[PDB]
Amino acid sequence: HLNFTQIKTVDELNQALVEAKGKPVMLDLYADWCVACKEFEKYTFSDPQVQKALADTVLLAANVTANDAQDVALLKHLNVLGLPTILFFDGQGQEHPQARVTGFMDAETFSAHLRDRQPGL
């Protein structure tokens, strides 16, 4: 398993971004009712080469299972329309929307995505 730091709100994300100055960041958004999110955890975040590739990346995640007010505010703020979504931030805490992942990617596909599109590295 990869070690994700849980964030709940917009400003916990922002703070995490500020604290991560100089490092690449990755924000995974999941929910318990999300089938493809679990696929990601089981078949992709579990890959030995995927994990190596994220070794130096700050790992954040938001559990939006409850779809409460803070969850919805976070999703809006990030313009996230469905799950799974993964967002990527460079070393200045800026997002690179062109690196978003918005469906399941298998290990080989996600490796290639990180190699070809991951920011801040």
Residue numbers in the entry: 428 to 548
Task: Give verbatim excerpts from the published study on this entry.
The transmembrane thiol:disulfide oxidoreductase DsbD is a three-domain protein responsible for shuttling electrons from the cytoplasm to the oxidizing periplasm of Gram-negative bacteria. Its central domain (tmDsbD) is located in the inner bacterial membrane and is flanked by two periplasmic globular domains (nDsbD, the N-terminal domain, and cDsbD, the C-terminal domain). cDsbD, like many proteins involved in periplasmic oxidative protein folding, adopts the more conventional Trx fold. Its role is very specific, to acquire reductant from tmDsbD and transfer it to nDsbD.
In this work we have found that replacing Gln-488 with an alanine residue, which cannot form a hydrogen bond or a salt bridge in the active site, has a dramatic effect on the pKa value of Cys-461. Despite the presence of reducing agent (TCEP) in the mother liquor, both proteins were found to be oxidized with a Cys-461–Cys-464 disulfide bond clearly present. The cysteine pair (Cys-461 and Cys-464), Asp-455, and Glu-468 of wild-type cDsbD overlay well with the same residues of Q488A-cDsbD. The only difference is that the side chain of Gln-488 is absent in Q488A-cDsbD and replaced by the much shorter alanine side chain. The carboxyl side chains of Asp-455 and Glu-468 in both wild-type and Q488A-cDsbD are oriented toward Cys-461 and remain in close proximity (<∼8 Å) to the N-terminal cysteine of the -CXXC- motif. The side chain solvent accessibilities of Asp-455 (9%) and Glu-468 (57%) in Q488A-cDsbD are comparable with those in wild-type cDsbD (7% for Asp-455 and 42% for Glu-468). In wild-type cDsbD, the hydrogen bond interaction with Gln-488 stabilizes the carboxylate group of Asp-455 and results in a pKa value of 5.8 or 6.7, depending on the oxidation state of the protein. In Q488A-cDsbD, the absence of this stabilizing interaction leads to a further elevation of the pKa value of Asp-455 to a point where it becomes indistinguishable from the pKa value of Cys-461. The phenomenon of microscopic pKa values occurs between Asp-455 and Cys-461 in Q488A-cDsbDred and, as a result, in a fraction of the protein molecule population Cys-461 has a pKa value of 7.6, which makes it significantly more reactive and prone to reoxidation compared with the wild-type domain. This was apparent when we measured the activity of this variant in the full-length protein in vivo; Q488A-DsbD was only ∼75% functional compared with wild-type-DsbD, consistent with part of the protein population being compromised.
